[PDB]
Amino acid sequence: CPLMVKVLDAVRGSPAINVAVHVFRKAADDTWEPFASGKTSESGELHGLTTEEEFVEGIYKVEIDTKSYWKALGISPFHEHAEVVFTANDSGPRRYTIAALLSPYSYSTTAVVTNP
Amino acid sequence: CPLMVKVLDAVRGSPAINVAVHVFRKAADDTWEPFASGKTSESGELHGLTTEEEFVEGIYKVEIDTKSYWKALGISPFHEHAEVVFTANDSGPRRYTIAALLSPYSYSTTAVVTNP
Amino acid sequence: CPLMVKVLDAVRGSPAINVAVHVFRKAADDTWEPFASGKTSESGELHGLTTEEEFVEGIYKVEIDTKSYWKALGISPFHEHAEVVFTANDSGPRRYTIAALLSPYSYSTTAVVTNP
Amino acid sequence: CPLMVKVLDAVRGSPAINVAVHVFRKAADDTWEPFASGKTSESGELHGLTTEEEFVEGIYKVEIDTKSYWKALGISPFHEHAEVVFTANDSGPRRYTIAALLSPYSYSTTAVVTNP
């Protein structure tokens, strides 16, 4: 499972559950082609987005629907989404964990990359 | 000066100097129209991006060229760039400061929205 | 396992392995009494610090030896350690996950708290 | 003004105003000796903590009373306070800005060390 996303809520001190995540891959014409998407689980994790074979080298964008999350809590959000844009697999397959920590007016993200 | 961007380096504990920043406004056709751009100063700040008359409500994207910053320092980066996507809403305060804290595999961003 | 600590490295994009973590509990005389300690595993996680019975209500301080971590990489660190000070279990047992993200001149921390 | 502290609120997207900040210097007996303190201004900043003549090399602790900030706003906080523990070293730049970004269950802190 070479791409995993984990999302946490800094207001409530919890996983961010049922958060939509879209992944895009930059196409030859410089547009963002849909690649994979899903929603975080009760643990704030989203597994099963892709497979080693599907996950070719390229520039990927992970877009996390932070706005819907805050609106369902009735808290005013600043951002439309949180983004994570990176080149993947250009030296062969790697496993990427993208973590995001959400506040209404801030987010932080980090990547953990391992070589299988 | 309703929009300011500030960028900091968490590896060296310094302003992030000469970082390219591009701002886009979402057009009616859902494309991103160039809006403003510049390079951070010696203080890590980019002032004078826009004026009150130009900065209307809407969805804006700030792209910060973090990869070029790191690669010139001889430190391997993860991201292509950092993004900040938000709605500018005339309700509430009128000056937006977008801050970004950079690490090779992580970033944090916050918005500070104030009157004077 | 009611107290877990996870530590990530924002420079290398990895778990922070073999990081020392000390936990203290504020004593009646306002000094910090040693409570539990350990080192993060290959996954950056430290489990097994305490048990429900040992982990009474009180004010706890988690001190993460960030300085040794950076010095073993030959990277100059700013902080002596990273701290996380909080009241625990004052409404009965809870499970606390303390996450920390380390850069040489910055750290971020968040807590996930669940009710067993 | 060799030491400045800046505090931001990630829930409301604002400076964190009237936040108590205490600075301590580690004494020879390993106790923390009061060194400087104050409250953040309307801009979230605390200037004038010390002078060049007073701020000698050594280990310093900055304690930021985050709990009092949140509890007065009617938002439940996790931490008792935030801490920043660091060595002041006269090698390298001479002005230290300690920034803290607050959320109820999280904080981020960075140091920016500059000359003018």
Residue numbers in the entry:
A (entry chain A), B (entry chain B), C (entry chain A), D (entry chain B): 10 to 125
Which lines from the publication concern this structure?
Here, a series of new methods are presented based on the use of a low X-ray-background film as a crystallization support and a photoablation laser that enable the automation of major operations required for the preparation of crystals for X-ray diffraction experiments. In this approach, the controlled removal of the mother liquor before crystal mounting simplifies the cryocooling process, in many cases eliminating the use of cryoprotectant agents, while crystal-soaking experiments are performed through diffusion, precluding the need for repeated sample-recovery and transfer operations. We have previously shown that the transfer of crystals to X-ray data-collection pins can be automated through the so-called CrystalDirect approach, which relies on the use of a thin, low X-ray-background film as a crystallization support from which crystals are recovered by excising the film with a laser beam and attaching it to an X-ray data-collection pin. The CrystalDirect system enables the automation of sample mounting and cryocooling and can contribute to closing the automation gap that currently exists between crystallization and X-ray data collection.
Some of these crystals grew in conditions that require the addition of cryoprotectants when processed by standard manual methods. However, in all cases tested the automated laser mounting and direct cryocooling after liquid removal with the CrystalDirect robot produced samples with very good diffraction properties leading to high-quality structural models.
